[PDB]
Specification:
Chain lengths: 49, 49
């Protein structure tokens, strides 16, 4: 096992904080808060032109 | 300016790839693909008990 960084409280790829609640795409972890933040940030699909 | 890592193609906090399309919460960047991936992964709110 030398690829995926698991850890007990997975460190938030965003917050840099060790959290046990969130998701994991590849080997990383977006904390559940950021995980919702993202959905909330992406709400700008159209451009400003 | 010594806090936020901008860069031209913001590196995906997930893919480790330099992408100009995606979001940014704090100082990081989830590529737009991962940004959708997350929403898709979080669809497991209830527990397996
Ligand atoms: Zn976070
Ligand atoms: Zn990505």
């Amino acid at each position: 096992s030398m690829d995926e960084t698991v850890k007990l409280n997975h460190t938030c790829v965003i917050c840099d904080q060790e959290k046990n609640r969130g998701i994991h795409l590849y080997t990383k972890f977006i904390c559940l808060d950021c995980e919702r933040k993202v959905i909330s940030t992406s709400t700008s699909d159209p451009d400003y032109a």
